């Protein structure tokens, strides 16, 4: 048994500092000089974890997420006998933030993993029917482990990028007939397209794309929208203790999708697609 | 300044009135930019030009200073007694208050008040509630029955001008939702029909 | 895969796309719980118990300005078609967070510093929308407990089934449909409290569905109010 | 690892209230007007949980227990290859009582489940050899989950009633040859007879059948006796921190069995047998 | 199924129905434990260690008027015919509760407010009756620790094997018999402390068995007393 | 009024005597309706018309006021020292007691008493035990050996009229079951044969 | 998730007592009269646990460890198809020491089990290729559970002795063809030789073999060396918060190995080999 | 089993027996961590974050004279050839203890009474020696955090492969070799901090290997110092 409790303040920011963060929002600009619709600088280092089948180290500002994949041969589920498996694990490592105690995934790491999982799944970006080796007898299980190494805000969007990047980076090895030969890369994980999650924080009267840690500490709530390149919405998650008007969500999605086009374009450049 | 309802049964989020009334803060009414909504299941009442919500619901008592309260002793600490007054907060009764002097070397055990004793006591401080048994009639309840009600229903058990208290008397109500005394059934009937006749 | 919209433009349970499942609401359902409620939407049934406000024994986990909401969404093992393991799943963990955070907006937690308010929800039958049915049962249980709230929370899942925007999904629709979007709000305050989409929708469909959800929500909200008022009026 | 500790007082009742509870025991009557040998009002709502294979909502006074069953096809244990399985799970839900924290079954929920399990098992009421589909290859596993929703005292006896009622209410679906077709109810769980548990609380000089929550808070100990309709004793469990004389148990069993006849009669009326 | 009562009216180990297995009791068995004991009944062997009374660090879990008894019944993985998983089972959880509650009646816990008394029991060999052997080892370990008690606790399982009431069951009898009824008491005080029946008996058989258990208990009680006295007399 | 036993070795639940004796409460004797039973492994002793049980068993010391005790410093708190006196309760030594004045600004560290220091001290309060080192000879143990025994065996280590203390002296016993000084072996021999010759 | 923290003092010994423990070290002698290179008195009671397949109750001074084995038939791991299994479990029972709370193995019990496991494994004393019944289809799994009953210091070395003794004491039962017949002891567990672990505590300027509890409470660190009779080092583990010079380890190994010869000789006498 | 020493006297990765894998050290790697470092030895890569000194909320677990070191060694699931379950294993539990105790000797914990210093280590790639790479990353992360230490800790595994004493093992060597002996020290202080041997060696080989490990350690130590100095010089 288990239970969701209101947390303490993990980043109590001073009343003085709240005003400084917002007071250039008039000009459409934030603390770090960037626009309300801008993402922070992004780097994606593919193959960072050399023993992963695929990996991506995502740096989105001061947020750092390392995703890695490991493929195994499994019997498929008797109900999904013509599909392989995706298992998404997100961990908020005690390295990432001062108040992160070591333990099993908490509700936030769990929430993160499930939102990433469903974005990846419901996008049809990873078509699991492609991961069959022998129908009804053997399939690929893709373990996607997403490890947040530095908590700098908007961890979800970085997790999605690292996840997609890790999957695109995933090597498939030759199957010999029953066993995997890792001396032979026979392919890469077949993805239809990238996905991106775009998080919009509600802060005072303003909507802020890609909240940093300070913005996250002062925001009323955020809502994340996931897109594929055709700009189908492929996941939405409102998060945080505060509410949002119907118009906030309407406008957040409009702003989210607008950013998605650019974020997807930069993701593709990082992926080499 | 307009009121939307007569003496109506009201619910959380229910619009009561629009305009700037000079209503004292109430936990049963939420004011948003000149609209007033009920925060509780309650009875909407208009009092002079102002209005209120009488909560019909609530198991808890909210501590207020100088409330005569009747509480159940839960724990006996080194320097006092931890007391249940049916609030979100445990009340504390200093031994020094009860005794009117210092707590002597290895003194007491549970002779003044034990665990499971009822106490009649006033709330001397609250901003956890600190109790006092200084006044007369305050102290350990020796005898009789202590009946429990919704603290929210206490004013109805007393009645305007003691009118309800008198009709139970001839046939002690604390703010606590506890009454030190069939009397039980008539009180349960006022709990379940406070909103009627 | 079953046909979700049938030739007569109707759904698998005979409903129109803009039509709600039958709702049944009971209050004062448990003796011990400070407040309680059973909420039925079609064949989805939740029970909620509220305890509090009460002091929070793990005192270092209490808040100095605020009550802590402690919320549990849980499904009984026999609420589903196949037996659900009683040990909390990741879904239940996520939904407990999402439901808590829904209630965070409504409950006037500033009224009770360093207390806890416990909201325990059990899904007795799961036939789609149980996070929302749980949430609304929680809302009603809180009102039943006399705990001050901004507003009641009403919610429905809208979605897409064979390209048709539908209000209040079945399990068949949730399982086999293209989109499932639970939304909950404080309707009188114009405020969204829970908002998730699982599946896939074009932005236009998203906005069509959002609009339909508000219409269903306003109906459910009226029934919540009427249900709370029923024992007094 | 794990350990049994003396608990705190979950219902500290006032010294004043203790006297009121007992002081009509002279007249053979309790607080609620009922006799020392009387059970509280009982309702049993069969099929309350519509997605359970069988269910029963038991209201015994203010005690509310919902039991539900779920049948699965399993390989039998290699040692019991000609029997199906009964797995009994009792949970004391945090909804049931103010001090019930959410978690895995504690020692009381566990004790409850095992006492119910053994009453059901040792009664021979559920003959597991009847639950075989194909001997040594496939059998029915009956998951009996018993969820206490309102803790009003004598939870054990309500759990036993709900358990028996749930089992009697259990639909068996057609097996097609390897798979269960739930569109076809081919039978009902085969039970030989009902069982009942009868709990007798030791309170002062008195023996009280079916203790309410107040009586439970003041009792020295209780002892529960399980009966089948032929009045074989089919389980006994002494519970509580206090002891009982040899004569208390002798007399409790005599009083228990006397009540069992009536309780079984009313159970059968609720079951339709 | 084996024949439990043989043609010569005797049991599988050669005993009469009214006959106890051999008992062996050692005290002062561990250096560190404030009190300790090994109790052997036939091939069932338990060791018990007592620590206390001692202050109880989880101070909010301490009792203001009373010592808290903290009791652990546990079986080693190699105490049984097949390996028992060392992680505590539900049986061990239940038996720990039942054994604690047995000791609750005997230990003069009011003497030590807000302290804990720890009673740790390990079954080294399980051949039926180990909850009782553990309980009696606990009792003896407490007496060995100088912790004041109402009385020692003596216990036996009686039962029914091929329709015959038998005293002090084997594992064969416990496994294959019709009834298994462990009973423990403070014999000088006439008080029952543990009482369970697993299986099935007519009320008359129940009372016959109850009577036989008291006779065995009084013998065991005498050996407990003699064992405690042996290092001084 | 009858006694069942001579100077006998006794065990929990063992009947000692029947009838109404005016015995002061003892933790080693349980009275039930005019029967008296031992609560411990002990030695039954008849003293004048009354009787007692001398416990032969017990690792713990039970705090009593004005007992000269020798304890081991466990923790050093902000305003005092937490002290192990081999009891179910940790003893506390106020710094103000030791110092005989206020605890000054940023004063001390462990100069008076550190962790691992033995202290000779009296029990000034117990109803947790509060210690005092006011009297002479009380304070930190600079030198010598501190030997541990069953606190239950202390009276035997001292002896009636110091007779046992004297026969160890020529060849400081605290109530604590601790003695500040081969002397060790003779004490272990009195622990293991207190009930004999 | 999990984490290693600096522990509190479980045996705070007085400053006065520290001096007494060491102050005969000049003479090459300890508190208990024994030499700095001496082990405490050792007894090994074989077959102490009658329902274990093999067992040994080790008393090394006031340290008491009971090891027991249980053999099961298993499929071997697909990677070790020509070997059986050894699973080593060490538990520090709450009976053993006042501050041992009941729970799952902590890092010390775990450390102990792994050091014993690797000593047994890396010694080649138990050759797992001998535990095959049918190659690639069925092998013996040896569950070695080592339960510390009395914590008197140098628990590791006692665990190793009890472990080795338990294994040597292990009965192998006849396999009938698929099932184990326990009425027929067909053999004993095949061991090449005994192993011993020798623990050397660093105390002030001195090296102390087989530290008692008091010595352990005052030592800077210990280092344990495992030997087989040919005096190959077969495991080493430095333990404790303190460091050791290169020369301390050099000298500890020289002293360890010297003691090993004698300890092995006495072990063999206890084993009957 | 692969040939570990090849005909040309060399190893599987082309190294001589006395030769180290390439080392790469980065400091100031994380924003939030008070101190941090990535340590690469060949294909073994660890990252370490240090937080502290900070007050220790479980105040009864704090030390009155000392900071508590709280150390976590953990491997990512994709650090290994086959996926490692993310739930901590017994190996990780043991290694966390061994690494903590290594740091206990170096960290000047007496400086910060009743505080905790948290040292979190993640192995991103495991190709042998990761406990040491983690330990050295921890050391460097502590120095990076400005936490006073006796000395840096440098470490290597030596071992035996086809009877040849080798410095700084591969995974192939660790898996298939005869001996694997990780050693860590405070090199300037002549003090060993971690010392384990898994496998088998004659005493002479043990001492040969010990000697070789010190030579590798002194090289690594120089690179640690140079790496810490690089951002200032
Ligand atoms: Cl849902
Ligand atoms: Cl048993
Ligand atoms: Cl390693
Ligand atoms: Mn697999
Ligand atoms: Mn109500
Ligand atoms: Mn199954
Ligand atoms: Mn002893
Ligand atoms: Mn197996
Ligand atoms: Mn820095």
Swiss-Prot record, chains A, D, G:
Q: How does it assemble?
A: Component of the archaeal exosome complex. Forms a hexameric ring-like arrangement composed of 3 Rrp41-Rrp42 heterodimers. The hexameric ring associates with a trimer of Rrp4 and/or Csl4 subunits.
Q: What is this protein called?
A: Exosome complex component Rrp42
Physiological role: Non-catalytic component of the exosome, which is a complex involved in RNA degradation. Contributes to the structuring of the Rrp41 active site.
- Species: Saccharolobus solfataricus (strain ATCC 35092 / DSM 1617 / JCM 11322 / P2)
Q: Which InterPro entries match?
A: ExoRNase_PH_dom1, ExoRNase_PH_dom2, ExoRNase_PH_dom2_sf, Exosome_comp_Rrp42_subfam, PNPase/RNase_PH_dom_sf, Ribosomal_Su5_D2-typ_SF, Rrp42_archaea
- UniProt-reported outcome of changing residue 216 to A: Does not change activity
Major location category of this protein: cytoplasm
The organism's place on the tree of life at top rank: Archaea
Any one Gene Ontology molecular-function term assigned to this protein's record: mRNA 3'-UTR AU-rich region binding
GO CC terms of this entry: cytoplasmic exosome (RNase complex)
Q: Name one Pfam family in it.
A: RNase_PH
Protein's cellular compartments: Cytoplasm
**Keywords (A to Z) from UniProt:** Cytoplasm, Exosome
Q: Which GO terms describe its biological process?
A: rRNA catabolic process
Q: Taxonomic classification, please?
A: Archaea, Thermoproteota, Thermoprotei, Sulfolobales, Sulfolobaceae
Under the heading CDD domains, the entry gives: RNase_PH_archRRP42 (cd11365)
User: What family is it from?
Assistant: Belongs to the RNase PH family. Rrp42 subfamily.
UniProtKB/Swiss-Prot annotation, chains B, F:
Q: Which first-to-last residue range defines the signal peptide? A: none
The free-text domain remark for this protein reads: Contains an N-terminal domain that mediates interactions with the hexameric ring, a central S1 domain and a C-terminal KH domain. The KH domain is required for efficient RNA degradation, but is not responsible for poly(A) preference.
SMART domains, alphabetized = S1
What is the role of the protein in this entry?
Non-catalytic component of the exosome, which is a complex involved in RNA degradation. Increases the RNA binding and the efficiency of RNA degradation. Confers strong poly(A) specificity to the exosome.
Protein's UniProt keywords contain RNA-binding: yes
Query: Record's CDD domains?
Result: KH-I_Rrp4_prokar, S1_Rrp4
Query: Which residues are in the KH domain?
Result: 144-187
Cellular component aspect of the GO annotation: cytoplasm; exosome (RNase complex)
> Which family does the UniProt entry place this protein in?
Belongs to the RRP4 family.
Locations listed in the record: Cytoplasm
- Cystine residue pairs: none
Q: How does it assemble?
A: Component of the archaeal exosome complex. Forms a trimer of Rrp4 and/or Csl4 subunits. The trimer associates with a hexameric ring-like arrangement composed of 3 Rrp41-Rrp42 heterodimers.
Which InterPro entries does its entry note? Exosome_RNA_bind1/RRP40/RRP4, KH_dom_type_1, KH_dom_type_1_sf, NA-bd_OB-fold, Rrp4, RRP4_N, RRP4_S1, S1_domain
Could you tell me what this protein is called? Exosome complex component Rrp4
SUPFAM superfamilies in alphabetical order: Eukaryotic type KH-domain (KH-domain type I) (SSF54791), Nucleic acid-binding proteins (SSF50249), Ribosomal L27 protein-like (SSF110324)
S1 motif domain residues: 66-134
**Database matches in PANTHER family:** EXOSOME COMPLEX COMPONENT RRP4, PNAS-3 RELATED
Which Gene Ontology BP terms does the record give?
CUT catabolic process; exonucleolytic trimming to generate mature 3'-end of 5.8S rRNA from tricistronic rRNA transcript (SSU-rRNA, 5.8S rRNA, LSU-rRNA); poly(A)-dependent snoRNA 3'-end processing; RNA catabolic process; U4 snRNA 3'-end processing
Organism equals: Saccharolobus solfataricus (strain ATCC 35092 / DSM 1617 / JCM 11322 / P2) (Sulfolobus solfataricus)
From Swiss-Prot, chains C, E, H:
Q: Which UniProt keywords apply?
A: Cytoplasm, Exonuclease, Exosome, Hydrolase, Nuclease
Return one Gene Ontology term, BP aspect: gene expression
Where is it located? Cytoplasm
A Gene Ontology molecular function term for this protein is: RNA binding
Q: State the source organism's domain of life.
A: Archaea
Q: What is the effect of changing residue 90 to E?
A: Abolishes exoribonuclease activity
Q: Which CDD domains match?
A: RNase_PH_archRRP41
Query: Cellular component per GO?
Result: cytoplasmic exosome (RNase complex)
Enzyme Commission number(s):
3.1.13.-
Known InterPro entries for this protein?
A: ExoRNase_PH_dom1 (IPR001247), ExoRNase_PH_dom2 (IPR015847), ExoRNase_PH_dom2_sf (IPR036345), PNPase/RNase_PH_dom_sf (IPR027408), Ribosomal_Su5_D2-typ_SF (IPR020568), RNase_PH (IPR050080), Rrp41 (IPR011807)
Q: Which Gene3D superfamilies match?
A: GHMP Kinase, N-terminal domain (3.30.230.70)
Instruction: Name one matching Pfam family.
Output: RNase_PH_C
Predominant location of this chain?
A: cytoplasm
Per UniProt, subunit arrangement is: Component of the archaeal exosome complex. Forms a hexameric ring-like arrangement composed of 3 Rrp41-Rrp42 heterodimers. The hexameric ring associates with a trimer of Rrp4 and/or Csl4 subunits.
Family note: Belongs to the RNase PH family. Rrp41 subfamily.
**Function statement:** Catalytic component of the exosome, which is a complex involved in RNA degradation. Has 3'->5' exoribonuclease activity. Can also synthesize heteromeric RNA-tails. Binds RNA.
Known NCBIfam families for this protein? ECX1 (TIGR02065)
* Protein name per the record: Exosome complex component Rrp41
Q: Gene for this protein?
A: rrp41
């Amino acid at each position: 048994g288990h239970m969701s409790s209101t947390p303490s303040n993990q980043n109590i920011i001073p009343i003085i500092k709240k005003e400084s963060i917002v007071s250039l929002f008039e000009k459409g600009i934030r603390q770090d000089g960037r626009k309300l619709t801008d993402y922070r600088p992004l780097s994606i280092t593919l193959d960072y974890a050399k023993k992963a089948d695929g990996s991506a180290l995502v740096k989105l500002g001061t947020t750092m997420v390392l995703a890695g994949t490991k493929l195994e041969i499994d019997k498929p589920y008797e109900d999904t006998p013509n599909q392989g498996n995706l298992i998404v694990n997100v961990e908020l490592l005690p390295l990432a933030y001062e108040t992160f105690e070591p333990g099993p995934p908490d509700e936030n790491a769990i929430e993160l993993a499930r939102v990433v999982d469903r974005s990846l799944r419901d996008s049809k970006a990873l078509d699991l029917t492609k991961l069959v080796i022998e129908p009804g007898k053997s399939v690929w299980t893709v373990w996607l482990d997403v490890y947040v190494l530095d908590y700098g805000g908007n961890v979800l969007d970085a997790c999605t990028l690292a996840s997609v990047a890790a999957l695109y980076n995933t090597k498939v090895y030759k199957v010999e007939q029953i066993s995997v030969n890792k001396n032979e890369v026979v392919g890469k994980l077949p993805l239809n397209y990238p996905v991106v999650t775009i998080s919009v924080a509600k802060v005072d009267k303003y909507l802020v794309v890609d909240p940093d840690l300070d913005e996250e500490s002062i925001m009323d709530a955020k809502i994340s929208f996931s897109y594929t390149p055709d700009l189908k919405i492929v996941g939405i998650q409102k998060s945080g203790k505060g509410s949002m008007s119907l118009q906030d969500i309407d406008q957040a999605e409009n702003t989210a999708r607008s950013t998605a086009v650019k974020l997807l374009e930069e993701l593709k450049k990082h992926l080499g697609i | 300044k307009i009121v939307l309802q007569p003496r109506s049964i009201v619910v959380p989020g229910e619009l009561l009135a629009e305009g700037e009334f000079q209503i004292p803060w109430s936990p049963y009414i939420l004011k948003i930019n000149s609209k007033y909504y009920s925060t509780v299941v309650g009875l909407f009442d208009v009092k002079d030009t102002q209005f209120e919500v009488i909560p019909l619901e609530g198991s808890f008592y909210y501590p207020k200073i100088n409330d005569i309260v009747i509480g159940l002793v839960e724990d006996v600490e080194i320097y006092g007694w931890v007391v249940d007054i049916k609030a979100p907060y445990k009340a504390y009764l200093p031994a020094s208050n009860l005794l009117g002097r210092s707590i002597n070397v290895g003194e007491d055990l549970r002779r003044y008040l034990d665990v499971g004793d009822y106490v009649i006591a006033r709330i001397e401080n609250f901003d956890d509630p600190v109790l006092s048994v200084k006044g007369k009639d305050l102290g350990r309840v020796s005898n009789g029955i202590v009946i429990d009600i919704m603290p929210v229903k206490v004013p109805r058990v007393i009645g305007k001008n003691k009118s309800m208290y008198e009709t139970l008397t001839s046939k002690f109500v604390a703010n606590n939702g506890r009454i030190w005394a069939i009397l039980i059934e008539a009180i349960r009937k006022i709990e379940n029909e406070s909103h009627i006749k | 895969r079953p046909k979700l919209i049938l030739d007569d433009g109707k759904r698998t349970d005979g409903r129109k796309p803009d039509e709600l499942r039958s709702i049944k609401i009971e209050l004062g359902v448990l003796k011990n719980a400070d407040g309680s409620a059973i909420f039925e939407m079609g064949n989805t049934k939740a029970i909620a118990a509220v305890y509090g406000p009460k002091e929070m024994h793990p005192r270092h986990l209490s808040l100095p300005d605020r009550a802590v909401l402690r919320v549990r969404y849980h499904m009984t093992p026999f609420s589903t078609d196949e037996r659900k393991n009683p040990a909390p799943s990741r879904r239940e963990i996520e939904l407990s967070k999402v439901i808590r955070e829904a209630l965070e907006s409504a409950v006037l937690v500033e009224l009770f510093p360093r207390t806890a308010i416990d909201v325990f929800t059990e899904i007795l039958q799961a036939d789609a929308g149980s996070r929302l049915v749980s949430l609304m049962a929680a809302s009603l249980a809180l009102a039943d407990a006399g705990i001050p709230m901004r507003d009641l929370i009403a919610g429905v899942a809208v979605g897409k089934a064979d390209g048709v925007i539908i209000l209040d999904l079945n399990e068949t629709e949730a399982m086999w449909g293209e989109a499932d979007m639970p939304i909950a709000m404080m309707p009188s305050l114009n405020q969204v409290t829970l908002f998730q989409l699982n599946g896939s929708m074009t932005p236009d469909e998203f906005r069509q569905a959002f609009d339909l959800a508000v219409k269903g929500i306003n109906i459910i909200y009226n029934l919540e109010r009427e249900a709370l008022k029923s024992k007094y009026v």
